[PDB]
mmCIF file of all heavy atoms in Angstrom:
data_model
loop_
_atom_site.group_PDB
_atom_site.id
_atom_site.type_symbol
_atom_site.label_atom_id
_atom_site.label_comp_id
_atom_site.label_asym_id
_atom_site.label_seq_id
_atom_site.Cartn_x
_atom_site.Cartn_y
_atom_site.Cartn_z
ATOM 1 N N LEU P 16 83.093 77.185 118.082
ATOM 2 C CA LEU P 16 82.099 78.218 117.782
ATOM 3 C C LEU P 16 80.675 77.650 117.751
ATOM 4 O O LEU P 16 79.789 78.272 117.158
ATOM 5 C CB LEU P 16 82.460 78.915 116.458
ATOM 6 C CG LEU P 16 83.824 79.617 116.454
ATOM 7 C CD1 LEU P 16 84.084 80.265 115.074
ATOM 8 C CD2 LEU P 16 83.963 80.636 117.585
ATOM 9 N N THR P 17 80.453 76.478 118.369
ATOM 10 C CA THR P 17 79.099 75.922 118.508
ATOM 11 C C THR P 17 78.876 75.611 119.990
ATOM 12 O O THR P 17 79.508 74.700 120.493
ATOM 13 C CB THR P 17 78.921 74.630 117.687
ATOM 14 O OG1 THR P 17 79.191 74.879 116.302
ATOM 15 C CG2 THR P 17 77.546 74.010 117.824
ATOM 16 N N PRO P 18 77.967 76.296 120.708
ATOM 17 C CA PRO P 18 77.641 75.941 122.098
ATOM 18 C C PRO P 18 77.120 74.519 122.226
ATOM 19 O O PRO P 18 76.540 73.993 121.267
ATOM 20 C CB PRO P 18 76.554 76.937 122.519
ATOM 21 C CG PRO P 18 75.982 77.457 121.199
ATOM 22 C CD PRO P 18 77.146 77.425 120.223
ATOM 23 N N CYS P 19 77.391 73.868 123.377
ATOM 24 C CA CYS P 19 76.967 72.481 123.517
ATOM 25 C C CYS P 19 75.495 72.439 123.925
ATOM 26 O O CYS P 19 74.844 71.434 123.700
ATOM 27 C CB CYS P 19 77.808 71.640 124.486
ATOM 28 S SG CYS P 19 77.967 72.374 126.135
ATOM 29 N N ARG P 20 75.027 73.484 124.581
ATOM 30 C CA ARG P 20 73.604 73.621 124.883
ATOM 31 C C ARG P 20 73.265 75.093 124.672
ATOM 32 O O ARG P 20 74.026 75.983 125.073
ATOM 33 C CB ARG P 20 73.321 73.173 126.335
ATOM 34 C CG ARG P 20 73.418 71.675 126.585
ATOM 35 C CD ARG P 20 72.364 70.754 125.953
ATOM 36 N NE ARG P 20 70.998 71.096 126.434
ATOM 37 C CZ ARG P 20 70.282 70.367 127.304
ATOM 38 N NH1 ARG P 20 70.765 69.243 127.815
ATOM 39 N NH2 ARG P 20 69.077 70.783 127.687
ATOM 40 N N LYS P 21 72.121 75.378 124.059
ATOM 41 C CA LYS P 21 71.739 76.774 123.914
ATOM 42 C C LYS P 21 70.591 77.114 124.852
ATOM 43 O O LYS P 21 70.120 78.252 124.834
ATOM 44 C CB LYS P 21 71.219 77.045 122.496
ATOM 45 C CG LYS P 21 72.171 76.710 121.363
ATOM 46 C CD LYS P 21 71.977 77.689 120.212
ATOM 47 C CE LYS P 21 73.133 77.745 119.238
ATOM 48 N NZ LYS P 21 72.969 76.769 118.135
ATOM 49 N N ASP P 22 70.115 76.144 125.631
ATOM 50 C CA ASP P 22 68.890 76.323 126.400
ATOM 51 C C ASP P 22 69.178 76.354 127.902
ATOM 52 O O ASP P 22 68.265 76.654 128.673
ATOM 53 C CB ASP P 22 67.853 75.213 126.120
ATOM 54 C CG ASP P 22 68.380 73.773 126.195
ATOM 55 O OD1 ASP P 22 69.624 73.561 126.122
ATOM 56 O OD2 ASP P 22 67.541 72.849 126.308
ATOM 57 N N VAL P 23 70.420 76.037 128.317
ATOM 58 C CA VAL P 23 70.735 75.910 129.743
ATOM 59 C C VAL P 23 72.152 76.423 130.018
ATOM 60 O O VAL P 23 72.981 76.479 129.118
ATOM 61 C CB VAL P 23 70.620 74.447 130.230
ATOM 62 C CG1 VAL P 23 69.193 73.904 130.181
ATOM 63 C CG2 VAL P 23 71.557 73.482 129.516
ATOM 64 N N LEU P 24 72.395 76.830 131.272
ATOM 65 C CA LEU P 24 73.716 77.186 131.771
ATOM 66 C C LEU P 24 74.520 75.895 132.008
ATOM 67 O O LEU P 24 74.094 75.029 132.803
ATOM 68 C CB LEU P 24 73.495 77.947 133.091
ATOM 69 C CG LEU P 24 74.765 78.497 133.725
ATOM 70 C CD1 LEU P 24 75.333 79.598 132.828
ATOM 71 C CD2 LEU P 24 74.496 79.031 135.144
ATOM 72 N N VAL P 25 75.720 75.774 131.399
ATOM 73 C CA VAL P 25 76.542 74.566 131.536
ATOM 74 C C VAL P 25 77.818 74.798 132.369
ATOM 75 O O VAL P 25 78.604 73.863 132.582
ATOM 76 C CB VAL P 25 76.852 73.951 130.150
ATOM 77 C CG1 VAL P 25 75.538 73.696 129.394
ATOM 78 C CG2 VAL P 25 77.723 74.905 129.327
ATOM 79 N N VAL P 26 77.982 76.009 132.928
ATOM 80 C CA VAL P 26 79.118 76.305 133.804
ATOM 81 C C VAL P 26 78.693 77.345 134.835
ATOM 82 O O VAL P 26 78.040 78.340 134.475
ATOM 83 C CB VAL P 26 80.381 76.754 133.029
ATOM 84 C CG1 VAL P 26 80.169 77.951 132.112
ATOM 85 C CG2 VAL P 26 81.607 76.985 133.914
ATOM 86 N N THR P 27 79.120 77.142 136.098
ATOM 87 C CA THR P 27 78.802 78.130 137.130
ATOM 88 C C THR P 27 79.706 79.358 136.998
ATOM 89 O O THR P 27 80.732 79.316 136.319
ATOM 90 C CB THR P 27 78.931 77.583 138.555
ATOM 91 O OG1 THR P 27 80.339 77.466 138.828
ATOM 92 C CG2 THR P 27 78.222 76.234 138.720
ATOM 93 N N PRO P 28 79.374 80.483 137.667
ATOM 94 C CA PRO P 28 80.273 81.657 137.742
ATOM 95 C C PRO P 28 81.634 81.407 138.415
ATOM 96 O O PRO P 28 82.520 82.250 138.309
ATOM 97 C CB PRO P 28 79.435 82.780 138.426
ATOM 98 C CG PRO P 28 78.022 82.269 138.345
ATOM 99 C CD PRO P 28 78.036 80.751 138.226
ATOM 100 N N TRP P 29 81.803 80.257 139.118
ATOM 101 C CA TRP P 29 83.109 79.908 139.692
ATOM 102 C C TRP P 29 83.739 78.768 138.878
ATOM 103 O O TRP P 29 84.693 78.103 139.317
ATOM 104 C CB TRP P 29 83.014 79.619 141.208
ATOM 105 C CG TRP P 29 82.041 78.512 141.565
ATOM 106 C CD1 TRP P 29 82.320 77.177 141.647
ATOM 107 C CD2 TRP P 29 80.629 78.639 141.812
ATOM 108 N NE1 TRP P 29 81.173 76.462 141.950
ATOM 109 C CE2 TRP P 29 80.131 77.340 142.100
ATOM 110 C CE3 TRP P 29 79.724 79.711 141.817
ATOM 111 C CZ2 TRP P 29 78.785 77.105 142.364
ATOM 112 C CZ3 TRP P 29 78.393 79.493 142.118
ATOM 113 C CH2 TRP P 29 77.931 78.191 142.378
ATOM 114 N N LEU P 30 83.262 78.642 137.616
ATOM 115 C CA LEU P 30 83.856 77.747 136.611
ATOM 116 C C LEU P 30 83.763 76.279 137.031
ATOM 117 O O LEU P 30 84.625 75.466 136.693
ATOM 118 C CB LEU P 30 85.290 78.161 136.262
ATOM 119 C CG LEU P 30 85.417 79.535 135.606
ATOM 120 C CD1 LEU P 30 86.896 79.882 135.480
ATOM 121 C CD2 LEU P 30 84.661 79.583 134.249
ATOM 122 N N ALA P 31 82.672 75.910 137.705
ATOM 123 C CA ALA P 31 82.390 74.486 137.892
ATOM 124 C C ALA P 31 81.445 74.069 136.762
ATOM 125 O O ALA P 31 80.406 74.718 136.550
ATOM 126 C CB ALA P 31 81.713 74.270 139.258
ATOM 127 N N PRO P 32 81.671 72.945 136.065
ATOM 128 C CA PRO P 32 80.689 72.455 135.073
ATOM 129 C C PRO P 32 79.346 72.133 135.726
ATOM 130 O O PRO P 32 79.311 71.664 136.861
ATOM 131 C CB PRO P 32 81.300 71.122 134.659
ATOM 132 C CG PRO P 32 82.783 71.317 134.912
ATOM 133 C CD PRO P 32 82.832 72.054 136.239
ATOM 134 N N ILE P 33 78.265 72.442 135.026
ATOM 135 C CA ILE P 33 76.928 71.972 135.386
ATOM 136 C C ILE P 33 76.595 70.838 134.422
ATOM 137 O O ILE P 33 76.578 71.034 133.193
ATOM 138 C CB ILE P 33 75.883 73.104 135.330
ATOM 139 C CG1 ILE P 33 76.339 74.323 136.158
ATOM 140 C CG2 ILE P 33 74.537 72.555 135.801
ATOM 141 C CD1 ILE P 33 75.371 75.524 136.084
ATOM 142 N N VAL P 34 76.383 69.631 134.964
ATOM 143 C CA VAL P 34 76.369 68.421 134.140
ATOM 144 C C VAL P 34 74.953 68.179 133.583
ATOM 145 O O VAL P 34 74.054 67.797 134.324
ATOM 146 C CB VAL P 34 76.880 67.222 134.981
ATOM 147 C CG1 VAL P 34 76.965 65.948 134.128
ATOM 148 C CG2 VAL P 34 78.268 67.522 135.581
ATOM 149 N N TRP P 35 74.810 68.360 132.259
ATOM 150 C CA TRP P 35 73.621 68.037 131.476
ATOM 151 C C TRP P 35 74.017 67.074 130.353
ATOM 152 O O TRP P 35 75.149 67.101 129.868
ATOM 153 C CB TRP P 35 73.064 69.306 130.811
ATOM 154 C CG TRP P 35 72.681 70.431 131.713
ATOM 155 C CD1 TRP P 35 73.484 71.475 132.115
ATOM 156 C CD2 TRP P 35 71.355 70.739 132.176
ATOM 157 N NE1 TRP P 35 72.757 72.378 132.842
ATOM 158 C CE2 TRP P 35 71.442 71.953 132.898
ATOM 159 C CE3 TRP P 35 70.114 70.078 132.069
ATOM 160 C CZ2 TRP P 35 70.315 72.541 133.512
ATOM 161 C CZ3 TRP P 35 68.996 70.650 132.665
ATOM 162 C CH2 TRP P 35 69.110 71.851 133.391
ATOM 163 N N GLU P 36 73.028 66.342 129.817
ATOM 164 C CA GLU P 36 73.282 65.588 128.599
ATOM 165 C C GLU P 36 73.696 66.558 127.483
ATOM 166 O O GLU P 36 73.126 67.647 127.345
ATOM 167 C CB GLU P 36 72.037 64.774 128.221
ATOM 168 C CG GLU P 36 72.296 63.781 127.078
ATOM 169 C CD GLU P 36 73.298 62.668 127.328
ATOM 170 O OE1 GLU P 36 73.648 62.381 128.492
ATOM 171 O OE2 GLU P 36 73.663 61.995 126.359
ATOM 172 N N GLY P 37 74.728 66.143 126.726
ATOM 173 C CA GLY P 37 75.292 66.943 125.646
ATOM 174 C C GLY P 37 76.543 67.705 126.073
ATOM 175 O O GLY P 37 77.243 68.240 125.196
ATOM 176 N N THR P 38 76.854 67.728 127.387
ATOM 177 C CA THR P 38 78.038 68.455 127.841
ATOM 178 C C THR P 38 79.272 67.550 127.897
ATOM 179 O O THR P 38 80.386 68.056 127.982
ATOM 180 C CB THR P 38 77.841 69.124 129.209
ATOM 181 O OG1 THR P 38 77.641 68.150 130.238
ATOM 182 C CG2 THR P 38 76.741 70.164 129.199
ATOM 183 N N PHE P 39 79.099 66.213 127.914
ATOM 184 C CA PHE P 39 80.235 65.308 128.118
ATOM 185 C C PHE P 39 80.243 64.194 127.070
ATOM 186 O O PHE P 39 79.186 63.688 126.634
ATOM 187 C CB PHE P 39 80.265 64.708 129.534
ATOM 188 C CG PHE P 39 79.011 63.960 129.937
ATOM 189 C CD1 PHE P 39 78.938 62.582 129.775
ATOM 190 C CD2 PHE P 39 77.907 64.645 130.453
ATOM 191 C CE1 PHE P 39 77.797 61.866 130.140
ATOM 192 C CE2 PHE P 39 76.755 63.936 130.821
ATOM 193 C CZ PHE P 39 76.703 62.554 130.660
ATOM 194 N N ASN P 40 81.466 63.770 126.722
ATOM 195 C CA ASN P 40 81.741 62.546 125.979
ATOM 196 C C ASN P 40 82.115 61.448 126.974
ATOM 197 O O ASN P 40 83.229 61.430 127.499
ATOM 198 C CB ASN P 40 82.868 62.760 124.948
ATOM 199 C CG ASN P 40 83.119 61.505 124.127
ATOM 200 O OD1 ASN P 40 82.925 60.420 124.604
ATOM 201 N ND2 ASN P 40 83.544 61.644 122.888
ATOM 202 N N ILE P 41 81.184 60.501 127.214
ATOM 203 C CA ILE P 41 81.361 59.540 128.289
ATOM 204 C C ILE P 41 82.516 58.583 127.972
ATOM 205 O O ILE P 41 83.091 57.986 128.888
ATOM 206 C CB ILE P 41 80.038 58.769 128.584
ATOM 207 C CG1 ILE P 41 80.121 57.963 129.895
ATOM 208 C CG2 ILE P 41 79.639 57.882 127.402
ATOM 209 C CD1 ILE P 41 80.468 58.793 131.110
ATOM 210 N N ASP P 42 82.834 58.412 126.679
ATOM 211 C CA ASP P 42 83.935 57.517 126.329
ATOM 212 C C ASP P 42 85.272 58.070 126.850
ATOM 213 O O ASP P 42 86.130 57.318 127.349
ATOM 214 C CB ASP P 42 84.003 57.319 124.811
ATOM 215 C CG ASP P 42 82.783 56.594 124.223
ATOM 216 O OD1 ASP P 42 82.230 55.674 124.895
ATOM 217 O OD2 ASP P 42 82.392 56.945 123.085
ATOM 218 N N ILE P 43 85.465 59.390 126.728
ATOM 219 C CA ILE P 43 86.707 59.978 127.204
ATOM 220 C C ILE P 43 86.752 59.887 128.737
ATOM 221 O O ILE P 43 87.776 59.516 129.308
ATOM 222 C CB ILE P 43 86.847 61.443 126.730
ATOM 223 C CG1 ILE P 43 86.813 61.534 125.191
ATOM 224 C CG2 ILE P 43 88.110 62.047 127.326
ATOM 225 C CD1 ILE P 43 86.682 62.998 124.655
ATOM 226 N N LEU P 44 85.630 60.225 129.387
ATOM 227 C CA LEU P 44 85.650 60.229 130.845
ATOM 228 C C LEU P 44 85.835 58.806 131.386
ATOM 229 O O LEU P 44 86.529 58.609 132.384
ATOM 230 C CB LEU P 44 84.357 60.856 131.376
ATOM 231 C CG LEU P 44 84.164 62.350 131.078
ATOM 232 C CD1 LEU P 44 82.759 62.729 131.434
ATOM 233 C CD2 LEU P 44 85.129 63.225 131.846
#
């Protein structure tokens, strides 16, 4: 219930992620 960014679109309409800082945990990836 907390958006990762409130100022930018982080997913396209075809459900591809749009990669910004704050969208990913680099340790997991």
Side-chain angles (χ1 to χ4, degrees):
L16 299 179
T17 302
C19 54
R20 288 292 300 253
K21 303 213 161 90
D22 49 342
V23 294
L24 184 67
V25 305
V26 56
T27 74
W29 57 89
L30 296 173
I33 308 177
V34 184
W35 302 91
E36 189 63 17
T38 65
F39 57 95
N40 182 330
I41 192 56
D42 295 324
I43 301 169
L44 294 170

